[PDB]
Write a protein that binds this ligand. Structure first.
Ligand code: A1EHE
Ligand code: A1EHE
Length: 147
């Protein structure tokens, strides 16, 4: 019935059904539509004080809490979904990964190369789809599958 990792849920505020993916943390109103050797993704990383390396090109010492980083991620997702901002623009300005300089593009990769929650979300995304918040040892990611 539902593509890999999708479940039905019910909105607390409106009562209408929606769909949630427990691998990508994506959520949407419409019923989801429905593996390759390699996928290509971009990402926006927000680091926090418990990141493996709590430092980035934006900040020599990253001090924000994980909960604060999640709030920032959620705000970026809202602006991307409304069209107020583009993913690529937010990645270049605010991603704590050096890949910010390439609008978040990481290039193409296979299974076994990236951290596992990132890998699993990337491969479960369909081409053009965006994840919700994905947690790794690096921080919290928004992932966009481009190929
Ligand atoms: N909602 C949350 C997000 C991220 C970290 C947290 N830590 C403690 C309690 C709640 C949290
Ligand atoms: N750290 C990085 C990882 C993957 C791709 C990148 N592209 C440009 C700059 C930094 C990158």
């Amino acid at each position: 019935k539902l593509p890999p990792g999708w479940e039905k849920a019910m909105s607390r505020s409106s009562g209408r059904v929606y769909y949630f993916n427990h691998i990508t943390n994506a959520s949407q109103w419409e019923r989801p539509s429905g593996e390759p050797a390699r996928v290509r993704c971009s990402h926006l990383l927000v680091k926090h004080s418990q990141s493996r390396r709590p430092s980035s090109w934006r900040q020599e010492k990253i001090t924000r809490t994980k909960e604060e980083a999640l709030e920032l991620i959620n705000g970026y997702i809202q602006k991307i979904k409304s069209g107020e901002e583009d993913f690529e623009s937010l990645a270049s300005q605010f991603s704590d990964c050096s890949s910010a300089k390439a609008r978040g593009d990481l290039g193409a990769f296979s299974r076994g190369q990236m951290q596992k929650p990132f890998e699993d979300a990337s491969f479960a995304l369909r081409t053009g789809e965006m994840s919700g918040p994905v947690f790794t040892d690096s921080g919290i990611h928004i992932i966009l599958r481009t190929e």
